[PDB]
C-alpha cells in the first residue's frame, strides 16, 4: 500500500526524508528549499512557486496571467513557518483522503512507481544517464550555511505552494534543449504548484444550486479532487505519454469569441467526461500512435542498455526490471524485451481514460464541473480543511453525520456556509473585453462569458488521406473509455517490482529550460456597434448607487438611462411593475406583479404544435437578441422558418473532408489474400463512417453546443436580472411608506423572492430543454447530413474501386468473383446509422439525444409550409422547392393544383437523409379537397386516373393518384414491382363527408404494410412484403398528370413526410392539431366568413333545408331535392337550396365588407328575402321548452332577442357549429340553441307533422354530454357556392 509520512515544518533536516533541495529550475544555483518526503519519490516544498515569475507579479494588478481565470492574489500566503506547516499538514490530509479509496491509492502507487527513465532523447540507446535535470535533483547535505556537500536523488513529483495566482494550480514538466522527456516515453521529474485553501467554484447550468437564485448558488470544489486532477497530469508526464498533438484552438476572429490558450487533448483526457469527445477519433489514434512509438523506443533501449555512465552504483538489472514493469513490457525466457499490444492497450487506456477527474469524482462521490468548457466563477476560501467538523479524509465536505452526503450538500455554497468565505474582489483580476460603440458607451464583459467557438484548425484532416488495404489490414478503434471497476480490481497493474534507492550521484549538468511568465492586460478594448447578447444583458442591469428604477420595453432607453431597466416581458407586466399605489393597496399589488412575473416566465413552456414544434421560449430573442437579430420581429415565426440556426451567434465552417481513396493490394493467384483485402476494405469503410461521425461530434460540442451553453447561461442571467429589478422596485416602493404604514402592510419579502426564484427555476428547466433540443437539432440536420454526403460520395468511389478490383482478379478469384461482386453491393448499400452514444457516454448528452429521437416531430423530413407568398420546406433539412406560376397559394396554407402545365411544384429532397432504412419506413400526410365530379362528365371522372404527386428515381418510387372518387397510393421497387393501396369515398350519398370537403390523409409504410388513414381512421391496408427496395428520395413533382378534364383541380395543405411509420395515435393527434382554429369553418372546411352568402345544413337532419314559409314569419323545414339525371354512378341531395343566409358582425361597425367569424363571436344571423335582408329572431317571452324562430325584416324590437353567439361545443374536429341565444352578451342567462323541432298540425283537411327552424333549451344540456353528439339538431354548417360543387 501507500505510506503517507508525518512531520512538522520545524522538524530537523535529516538529509533523507527532510532535506534542503535544489529545485530543477534553480539551475543549480540560488537557495535551497526545505523539502519533505510525503511518500516515496514525492516531495512537498511548502513555499510559493517563484520560478519564471516576477516578485511584484505576486501582487494583484491591472494585469492577469490567464485570460480564463478569475485570478486571486495574496503575496502573504505561506509567508510564515506556521503557514508552511498548515500547508504541510493539509497536504498530508489530502494525500490520506486520496488513498482512503482503492482508486486514489492506485493513482498514488502508479505515480510512486512510475519513475522516470534514466535518460532522455539525447542519451545513447545503450546508456543510462542520470546526470540530467529531469532525472536527478540535488539535496544539500553540508551543515547549515555552506553548499560544500551535495548529494543527488531520484524523484517523481515535487509539489510547491502556489505561484502568483493561488487558484491557478499547474503541473509542470522539464524541458531541455527544447524537448520534454515526459512527452517522449521517458518521463521526468514533475513539478506542481498547488493551493488547497483557495478552490474553484462552479454550478450545474442544467440545474440549480438548492433551487436558490437570490442565494449563493454554485458549488465549491473538493481540494482533493483538484489535487488528483493535477496528479493525473503528473501520471501522464511520469510515463512520458504527455504528448502534444493537434490542439483545440479557439476561433478569435469575432469580438464575441472567447480567447483562450490552445487546449491539448491530454488536458481533455484528464478531465474525462464529454471532453474526450471533443478530440476526434483521428487525433485519438494520432496520439495513441505517437505514444506507442515512444514505448517502442524505450523497449528498444532496454534491450540495448549496457551501462550507466553517470553513476557507477546504479544496478542495470534492477532498473531493467523496474522499467519493464513500469511500461508493462513482456520478456521471453531469454531476457529479450518486447511490446505486448494487449498490455500496452490496457495500460494506455487506463492512464488516458481510466484516471480522469470525472471518474474519480464519481468514485469519491465528489461534485465537479460538467465540462472543461464551463464558465468559471470566482474562487472561494475553505476556512479550515484541518477541522474534521468541516472536512474529513473519508468524505471530504460531504459528511453524512451532518447530512451533507446527499446531493453533494457539503459543497453547496447555499448550504455549507460555515465551510467557506467569499473573496475580496479587490484581490481578484479577470480578463475583460471592453465593448465600445464608435461614439460613447462601453460595456465590460468577462472573457469567460464570451462564446467559445473552436477554430476549424482544431480538427484533423486525416480522413482525407489515402489508405492502402491488405489481407492483414485491420480496423482501428480507440474507445475514450475504460471500466473503472476493472481498474480498481485489476490485480497485475500495481507494480510488485522493487523501487530502486533514491540516492545517486549529484547532478552537475543543470542545463534546463525555465519558463518565463508575465501578465498581460486584464482589459482589451474593442469597437462594435452591435447590440447582441452582451449589450442586451447589460441593458437589464443598473448601478448599485441607484435605487429608484423603472422597467421599459425599449432597449435603447434602457442603455441610455441608468434608472431605466430593460425588460423582455409583456407590456402589461412592465406597466404594472411601474405602477405606484397607496399603502393599503401595496400588498395586493405585490401579489399581482409577482404573480405576473411567474406567468410571464412560465411562457417558456409555450407550445407551437401547428408548426410542428413542441416547445418554444418566445421571449429568448427579446431577452438576448442573440444570433441573427432575434429581438426584431416575432421570434416564434423566425424560429419556425430558420430553426436553431437563428440563435447561433456564429455559424461554423465545418471540416468535412473527402475521404481518401483506398489503394487495394493485389495478390496474383492468391484467392485468400484477395478476398481478405476486399473484406478489410469493407470494414475499413465502416471505420471511415464512424470516424467521420466522431469528427462531426467533436465540432458540434466545441463550436455549436458551446454557443448553446452561453445562451442557456445568458437566459439564466436575464431571468435573474429581471427578478432583481422587480425586487428593487418592490423594496423602493415599500420603503417610501412610513413605519406606521409599513407596520400594517402584510408583505413577506422572503416569500416574494421565493415565488420569483421558483418561477425562474421552472423557466430555466424549460429553456434548457428547449436549447438542448435546438443543439441536437442543429447536429442532426445541419451537420450530420453534410457528412453523410461526403461519405456517400466516398462509398460510390469505393464501390467502383472494389468492382474494378474484383474484375482485374476475375481469374485469380476463380468462381467467386461474382459472389463477392454482390457482397460489395450489399455492404455499401446499408449506411451507418449515427449514434451519439458511440462517441460519448456522457449521460446528459445521451439523454439529450435519446429525447430528441423519441419525439416523432423530429422524424419530419419534409414539411412544406406557406411563407411570404411561397411554399418552403420547414423540416430543417433544406429541401429545394420550386412553385410554378400555375399554383395558387393563400396564407391559410392551401395550394391549388389545376390542369395548367405550369401548375406544379418541384421538390428536390435532401439526398443525405437516412430515408432508405433498408426496410421501407416512412409516412406521408396532408389535407386534400377534391372537387365534385361534373354530372355531364361522370364517365371520365370514374375511368380517368391521374397522378397528383409523383416521386420517382430509376423507375422506382411512389406516387399519389386519383381516379374519380378514389385516392391511390402506389409503390414501385427497383425491379418494377408495383403495389397499391387506396381509399374510395361513396358518390351516391345524399350528403357526402368527403366530396369537395377538406379531409386529412395519412399514408404509412413499414416492411409489411402500406396503410391509408383518413381523418385519423384507418381505411385500408395492403401487404407490401413482396415489394423490394423502393427509391423514395427522388424529386417530388406536385402536378395533375394523366387524362384530365380542363376543369380538373385539387386543393392541398400541410404536406408532410416522416422517415418513420406513424402510429394511429400520432395520426389522430396530427389530425386534431391541424384541425384546430380559433374560428369556425364552413361546410367545405374553410374559415367561416362574415358578409358571405351561405345556405344552411343541419347535421341532425342532413336532407333538410330552411325555407321562409309563404304566409308566416317562420322557417319551415323542407326535404332537399335530389340528383335528377339517370346516371347509375351518382346520387346526391342539392346543397344550394333554401334561404341564402349571411352572417353579420355585432360589435365594431367597421362597415360590412368581409372577415373571419371566431368562436364566441356575437353575430346577427340574416338571410335574403328577395331584395331585402331579413333577420333571425327569438320571441323573448316563451315558457315552453322550445319555440319557432321569428323571421322578419331588420328591426330592433323590445320583444325579440336578435343577438346570437356562435359557439363550438365539440372538442373534436368538426365543421359543425352551434348558435346560442343569450339574454345579452353579459348575462349567463342562456335562452337556448337554434335547431329543428317537429310539430303536429291538424287542420280541417290536412293532418301532419312538420318541422320548423327553432330555438330549444333542451340542447343546452345535450351539448355538454361526452362524447359530443354530432347528430344533434343544433349542429349547423354553412354552405357557400363553390366551384368545387356544381349541381
Using the rule CB under 5 A, give the single segment among 69-77, 370-378, 585-593, 818-826 that binds Zn ion.
370-378
Residues 915, 1032 contacting (CB under 8 angstroms): yes
**Alpha-carbon Rg of the chain, whole angstroms?**
40
Please tell me the distance from the alpha carbon of residue 1132 to that of residue 1134, in angstroms, as a whole number.
Answer: 7
Query: What is the CA angle 857-858-861, rounded to 5?
Result: 100
Q: Cβ 707 to Zn ion, closest distance in Å?
A: 11
Contact 371, 273 (CB under 8 A): yes
Which residue in 956, 959, 960, 958 sits closest to 973, CA to CA? 956
Q: How many DSSP H helices and E strands does the chain contain?
A: 25, 65
**What is d(CA 280, CA 6) in angstroms, rounded to the nearest whole number?**
45
- Residue 230 a catalytic site member: yes
For Zn ion, give the closer residue by CB, 192 or 1040. Answer: 192
What SS3 string covers 848-874?
Answer: HHHHHCCCHHHHEEEEEEECCCCEEEC
* Interatomic CA distance for residues 929 and 1285, integer angstroms: 11
Q: Does 267 appear as a known binding residue?
A: yes
Judged by beta carbon, residue 20 or residue 174, the one nearer Zn ion is 174
- Smallest distance, Å, CB 372 to Zn ion? 7
Helix (H, G, I), strand (E, B) or coil at 1269: coil
Q: Which is nearer to Zn ion, 373 or 927 (CB)?
A: 373
**Known binder of ligand: residue 1021?**
yes
Establish whether 616 is an annotated binding residue: no
First to last CA, the chain: 98
Minimum distance, C-beta of residue 1082 to Zn ion, in the bound complex (Å): 58
Q: Toward Zn ion, which CB reaches closer, 168 or 1186?
A: 168
Rounded Cα distance between 689 and 656, Å, is: 12
The binding track of 402-441 with respect to Zn ion, each residue x by CB under 5 A or -, is: ----------------------------------------
Nearer to Zn ion, 374 or 761 (CB): 374
**CB neighbours of 25 closer than 8 A, spacing ≥ 6?**
51, 52, 191, 512, 514
Of the listed pieces 11-19, 47-55, 452-460, 766-774, which binds Zn ion according to CB under 5 A? 452-460
748 burial level (CB within 10 Å; 0-12, 13-18, 19+): exposed
Residue nearest to Zn ion (CB): 452
Q: Considering the complex, what minimum distance in angstroms separates the CB of residue 88 from Zn ion?
A: 24
Residues 1014 and 999: beta-carbon distance below 8 Å? yes
Give the nearer residue to Zn ion in terms of CB position, either 238 or 390: 238
**Minimum distance, C-beta of residue 361 to Zn ion, in the bound complex (Å):** 14
**1003 membership: H or E segment, kind and range:** strand 999-1005
Residues 6+ apart with CB under 8 A from 1069: none
Q: Which part of the chain contacts Zn ion (CB under 5 A), choosing from 193-201, 450-458, 502-510, 1113-1121?
A: 450-458
Angle at 542 between CA 537 and CA 543, to 5 degrees: 130
Residue 303: which H helix or E strand, with range?
helix 281-304
Nearer to Zn ion, 67 or 685 (CB): 67
Range list of β-strands (E), 546-646: 550-552, 564-566, 606-608, 613-616
Q: If residue 727 lies in a helix (H) or strand (E), which one and from where to where?
A: helix 705-736
Hey, what's the cell of 204?
450545474
Q: Mark the segment that binds Zn ion (CB under 5 A) among 45-53, 373-381, 731-739, 916-924.
A: 373-381
Which residue out of 230, 502, 640, 1139 is catalytically annotated?
Answer: 230
Q: Which is nearer to Zn ion, 160 or 834 (CB)?
A: 160
CA dist., res. 987 & res. 991, Å (int)? 9
Closer to Zn ion by CB, 245 or 267: give it.
Answer: 267
Segment lying near Zn ion (by CB under 5 A), choices 367-375, 993-1001, 1148-1156, 1165-1173: 367-375
266 is in an annotated binding site: no
Q: Per the structure block, which three cell numbers stand in for 1187?
A: 319555440
Give whichever of 329 and 373 is closer to Zn ion, judged by the CB atom: 373
Number of residues that bind Zn ion (CB under 5 A): 3
1237 is in an annotated binding site: yes
Cβ 448 to Zn ion, closest distance in Å? Answer: 7
What letter does residue 207 receive in the DSSP assignment?
S
373/1083 with CB nearer Zn ion: 373
The nearest distance, CB 263 to Zn ion, in angstroms, is: 9
Grid coordinates representing 635 are: 421570434
Q: State CA 1280 to chain mean position distance.
A: 48
The answer to whether the beta carbons of residues 422 and 70 sit under 8 Å apart is no
Q: Which of 87, 319, 373, 510 touches Zn ion (CB under 5 A)?
A: 373
CA–CA separation, 806 and 799 (whole Å): 11
Binding mask 209-248 for Zn ion (x = CB under 5 A): ----------------------------------------
| DSSP one-letter code for 73 | B
203 is in an annotated binding site: no
Closer Cβ to Zn ion, 257 or 308, answer by number: 257
Residue 406, classified by CB atoms within 10 Å of its CB into exposed (0-12), middle (13-18) or buried (19+), is exposed
Neighbours of 156 (CB within 10 A): 24
1095 three-state secondary structure: strand
Contact partners, residue 396, CB within 8 Å, separation at least 6: 97, 222, 224, 364, 366, 410, 411
Distances in Å between the Cα of 510 and the Cα atoms of 593, 870, 1058 are 72, 76, 70
Closest approach, Cβ 171 to Zn ion, in A, equals: 7
Shortest separation between residue 711's beta carbon and Zn ion, angstroms: 14
Nearest to 1000 by CA among 849, 733, 1214: 1214
* Among 127-135, 259-267, 474-482, 709-717, the segment contacting Zn ion (CB under 5 A): 259-267
Question: Using CB under 5 A, which of 95, 329, 452, 1201 touches Zn ion?
Answer: 452
**CB of residue 258 to Zn ion, shortest distance in Å:** 6
Q: Of 135-143, 366-374, 686-694, 1050-1058, which part binds Zn ion (CB under 5 A)? A: 366-374
**Whole-number minimum distance, CB 472 to Zn ion, in Å?**
39
Least Å distance, CB 233 to Zn ion, is 6
Interface region with Zn ion, contact rule CB under 5 A, candidates 445-453, 510-518, 537-545, 726-734: 445-453
β-pairing, 63-64 vs 520-521, is antiparallel
Question: Which residues participate in catalysis according to the annotation?
Answer: 230
Binding-site residues from annotation for a ganglioside GT1b (d18:1(4E)):
1021, 1185-1186
Question: Can you give the binding site for Zn ion, defined by CB under 5 A?
Answer: 267, 373, 452
Binding-site residues from annotation:
229, 233, 267, 1021, 1185-1186, 1236-1237
Binding-site residues from annotation for Zn(2+):
229, 233, 267
Amino acid at each position: 500500500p501507500v505510506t503517507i509520512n508525518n512531520f512538522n515544518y520545524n522538524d530537523p533536516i535529516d538529509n533523507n526524508n527532510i532535506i534542503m533541495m535544489e529545485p530543477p529550475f534553480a539551475r543549480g544555483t540560488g537557495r535551497y528549499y526545505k523539502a519533505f518526503k510525503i511518500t516515496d519519490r514525492i516531495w512537498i516544498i511548502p513555499e510559493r512557486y517563484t520560478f519564471g515569475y516576477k516578485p511584484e507579479d505576486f501582487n494583484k494588478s491591472s494585469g492577469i496571467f490567464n485570460r480564463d481565470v478569475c485570478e486571486y492574489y495574496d503575496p502573504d500566503y505561506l509567508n510564515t513557518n506556521d503557514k508552511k506547516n498548515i500547508f504541510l499538514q493539509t497536504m498530508i490530509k489530502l494525500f490520506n483522503r486520496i488513498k482512503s479509496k482503492p482508486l486514489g491509492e492506485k493513482l498514488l502507487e502508479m505515480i510512486i512507481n512510475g519513475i522516470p527513465y534514466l535518460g532522455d532523447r539525447r542519451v545513447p540507446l545503450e546508456e543510462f544517464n542520470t546526470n540530467i535535470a529531469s532525472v536527478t535533483v540535488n539535496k544539500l547535505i553540508s551543515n547549515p550555511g555552506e553548499v560544500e556537500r551535495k548529494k543527488g536523488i531520484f524523484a517523481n513529483l515535487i509539489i510547491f505552494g502556489p505561484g502568483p495566482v493561488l487558484n491557478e494550480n499547474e503541473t509542470i514538466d522539464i524541458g531541455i534543449q527544447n524537448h520534454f522527456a515526459s512527452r517522449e516515453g521517458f518521463g521526468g521529474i514533475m513539478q506542481m504548484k498547488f493551493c488547497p485553501e483557495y478552490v474553484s467554484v462552479f454550478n450545474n447550468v442544467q440545474e440549480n444550486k438548492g433551487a436558490s437564485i437570490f442565494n449563493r448558488r454554485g458549488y465549491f470544489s473538493d481540494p482533493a479532487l483538484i489535487l488528483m486532477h493535477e496528479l493525473i497530469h503528473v501520471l501522464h508526464g511520469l510515463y512520458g505519454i504527455k504528448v502534444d498533438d493537434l490542439p483545440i484552438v479557439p476561433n478569435e476572429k469575432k469580438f464575441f469569441m472567447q480567447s483562450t490558450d490552445a487546449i491539448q487533448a491530454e488536458e481533455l483526457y484528464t478531465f474525462g467526461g464529454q471532453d474526450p469527445s471533443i478530440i476526434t477519433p483521428s487525433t485519438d489514434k494520432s496520439i495513441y500512435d505517437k505514444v506507442l512509438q515512444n514505448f517502442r523506443g524505450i523497449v528498444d533501449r532496454l534491450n540495448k542498455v549496457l551501462v550507466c555512465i553517470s553513476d557507477p552504483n546504479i544496478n542495470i538489472n534492477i532498473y531493467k526490471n523496474k522499467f519493464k514493469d513500469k511500461y508493462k513490457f513482456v520478456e521471453d525466457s531469454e531476457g529479450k524485451y518486447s511490446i505486448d499490444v494487449e498490455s500496452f492497450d490496457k495500460l494506455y487506456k487506463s492512464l488516458m481514460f481510466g484516471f480522469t477527474e470525472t471518474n474519480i469524482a464519481e468514485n469519491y462521490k465528489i461534485k465537479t464541473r460538467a465540462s472543461y468548457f464551463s464558465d468559471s466563477l470566482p474562487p472561494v476560501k475553505i476556512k479550515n480543511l484541518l477541522d474534521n467538523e468541516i472536512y474529513t479524509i473519508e468524505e471530504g465536505f460531504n459528511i453524512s453525520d451532518k447530512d451533507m452526503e446527499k446531493e453533494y450538500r457539503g459543497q453547496n455554497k447555499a448550504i455549507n456556509k460555515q465551510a467557506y468565505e467569499e473573496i475580496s474582489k479587490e484581490h481578484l483580476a479577470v480578463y475583460k473585453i471592453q465593448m465600445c460603440k464608435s461614439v460613447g458607451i462601453c460595456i465590460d464583459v468577462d472573457n469567460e462569458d464570451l462564446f467559445f467557438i473552436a477554430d476549424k484548425n482544431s480538427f484533423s484532416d486525416d480522413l482525407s488521406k489515402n489508405e492502402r488495404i491488405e489481407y492483414n489490414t485491420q480496423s482501428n478503434y480507440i474507445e475514450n473509455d475504460f471500466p473503472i471497476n476493472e481498474l480498481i480490481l485489476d490485480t497485475d497493474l500495481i507494480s510488485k517490482i522493487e523501487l530502486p534507492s533514491e540516492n545517486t550521484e549529484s547532478l552537475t549538468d543543470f542545463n534546463v529550460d525555465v519558463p518565463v511568465y508575465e501578465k498581460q492586460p486584464a482589459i482589451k478594448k474593442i469597437f462594435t456597434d452591435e447590440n447582441t447578447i452582451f449589450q442586451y444583458l447589460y441593458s437589464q442591469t443598473f448601478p448599485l448607487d441607484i435605487r429608484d428604477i423603472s422597467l421599459t420595453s425599449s432597449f435603447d432607453d434602457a442603455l441610455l438611462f441608468s434608472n431605466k431597466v430593460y425588460s423582455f416581458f409583456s407590456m402589461d407586466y412592465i406597466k404594472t411593475a411601474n405602477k405606484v399605489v397607496e399603502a393599503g393597496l401595496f400588498a395586493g399589488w405585490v401579489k399581482q406583479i409577482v404573480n405576473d412575473f411567474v406567468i410571464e416566465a412560465n411562457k417558456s413552456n409555450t407550445m407551437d404544435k401547428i408548426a410542428d414544434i413542441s416547445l418554444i421560449v418566445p421571449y429568448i430573442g427579446l431577452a438576448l437578441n442573440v444570433g441573427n437579430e432575434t429581438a426584431k420581429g416575432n421570434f416564434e415565426n423566425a424560429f419556425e422558418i430558420a430553426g436553431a440556426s437563428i440563435l447561433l451567434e456564429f455559424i461554423p465552417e465545418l471540416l468535412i473532408p473527402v475521404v481518401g481513396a483506398f489503394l487495394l493490394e493485389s495478390y496474383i493467384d492468391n484467392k485468400n489474400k484477395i478476398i481478405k483485402t476486399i473484406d478489410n476494405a469493407l470494414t475499413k469503410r465502416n471505420e471511415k463512417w464512424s470516424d467521420m461521425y466522431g469528427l462531426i461530434v467533436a465540432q458540434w460540442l466545441s463550436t455549436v453546443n458551446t454557443q448553446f451553453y452561453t445562451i442557456k447561461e445568458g437566459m439564466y442571467k436575464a431571468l435573474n436580472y429581471q427578478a432583481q429589478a422587480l425586487e428593487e422596485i418592490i423594496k423602493y416602493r415599500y420603503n417610501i411608506y412610513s413605519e406606521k404604514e409599513k407596520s400594517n402592510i402584510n408583505i413577506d419579502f422572503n416569500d416574494i423572492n421565493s415565488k420569483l426564484n421558483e418561477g425562474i427555476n421552472q423557466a430555466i428547466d424549460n429553456i434548457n430543454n428547449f436549447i438542448n433540443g435546438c443543439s441536437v437539432s442543429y447536429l442532426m440536420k445541419k451537420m450530420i447530413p453534410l457528412a453523410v454526403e461526403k461519405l456517400l460520395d466516398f462509398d460510390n468511389t469505393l464501390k467502383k474501386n472494389l468492382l474494378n478490383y474484383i474484375d482485374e482478379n476475375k481469374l485469380y478469384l476463380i468462381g467467386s468473383a461474382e459472389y463477392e461482386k454482390s457482397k460489395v453491393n450489399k455492404y455499401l448499400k446499408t449506411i451507418m446509422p449515427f449514434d451519439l452514444s458511440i462517441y460519448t457516454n456522457d449521460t446528459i448528452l445521451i439523454e439529450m439525444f435519446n429525447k430528441y429521437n423519441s419525439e416523432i416531430l423530429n422524424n419530419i423530413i419534409l414539411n412544406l409550409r406557406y411563407k411570404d407568398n411561397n411554399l418552403i420546406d420547414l423540416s430543417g433539412y433544406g429541401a429545394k422547392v420550386e412553385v410554378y406560376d400555375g399554383v395558387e397559394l393563400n396564407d391559410k396554407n392551401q395550394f391549388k393544383l389545376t390542369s395548367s402545365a405550369n401548375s406544379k411544384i418541384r421538390v428536390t429532397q435532401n439526398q443525405n437523409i437516412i430515408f432508405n432504412s433498408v426496410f421501407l419506413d416512412f409516412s406521408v400526410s396532408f389535407w386534400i379537397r377534391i372537387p365534385k365530379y361534373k354530372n355531364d362528365g361522370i364517365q371520365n371522372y370514374i375511368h380517368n386516373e391521374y397522378t397528383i404527386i409523383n416521386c420517382m428515381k430509376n423507375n422506382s418510387g411512389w406516387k399519389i393518384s386519383i381516379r374519380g372518387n378514389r385516392i391511390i397510393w402506389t409503390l414501385i421497387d427497383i425491379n418494377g414491382k408495383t403495389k397499391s393501396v387506396f381509399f374510395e369515398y361513396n358518390i351516391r350519398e345524399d350528403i357526402s363527408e368527403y366530396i369537395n370537403r377538406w379531409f386529412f390523409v395519412t399514408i404509412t409504410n413499414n416492411l409489411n404494410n402500406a396503410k391509408i388513414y383518413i381523418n385519423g381512421k384507418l381505411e385500408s391496408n395492403t401487404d407490401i412484403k413482396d415489394i423490394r427496395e423502393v427509391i423514395a428520395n427522388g424529386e417530388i413533382i406536385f402536378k395533375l398528370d394523366g387524362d384530365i378534364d380542363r376543369t380538373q383541380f385539387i386543393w392541398m395543405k400541410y404536406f408532410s413526410i416522416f422517415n418513420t411509420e406513424l402510429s394511429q395515435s400520432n395520426i389522430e393527434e396530427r389530425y386534431k392539431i391541424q384541425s384546430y382554429s380559433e374560428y369556425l369553418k364552413d361546410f367545405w372546411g374553410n374559415p367561416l366568413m362574415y358578409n358571405k352568402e351561405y345556405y344552411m345544413f343541419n347535421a341532425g337532419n342532413k336532407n333538410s333545408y330552411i325555407k321562409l314559409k309563404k304566409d308566416s314569419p317562420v322557417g319551415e323545414i323542407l326535404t332537399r331535392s335530389k340528383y335528377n339525371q339517370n346516371s347509375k354512378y351518382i346520387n346526391y341531395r342539392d346543397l344550394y337550396i333554401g334561404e341564402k343566409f349571411i352572417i353579420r358582425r355585432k360589435s365594431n361597425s367597421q362597415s360590412i365588407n368581409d372577415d373571419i367569424v371566431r368562436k364566441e363571436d356575437y353575430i346577427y344571423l340574416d338571410f335574403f328575402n328577395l331584395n331585402q335582408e331579413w333577420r333571425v329572431y327569438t320571441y323573448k317571452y316563451f315558457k315552453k321548452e322550445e319555440e319557432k324562430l321569428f323571421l322578419a325584416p331588420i328591426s330592433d324590437s323590445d320583444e325579440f332577442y336578435n343577438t346570437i353567439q356562435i359557439k363550438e361545443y365539440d372538442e373534436q374536429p368538426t365543421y359543425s357549429c352551434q348558435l346560442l341565444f343569450k339574454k345579452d352578451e353579459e348575462s349567463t342567462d342562456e335562452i337556448g340553441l337554434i335547431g329543428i323541432h317537429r310539430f303536429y298540425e291538424s287542420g280541417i283537411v290536412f293532418e301532419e307533422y312538420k318541422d320548423y327552424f327553432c330555438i330549444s333549451k333542451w340542447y343546452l344540456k345535450e351539448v355538454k354530454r361526452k362524447p359530443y353528439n354530432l347528430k344533434l339538431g343544433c349542429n349547423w354548417q354553412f354552405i357557400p357556392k363553390d366551384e368545387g360543387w356544381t349541381e
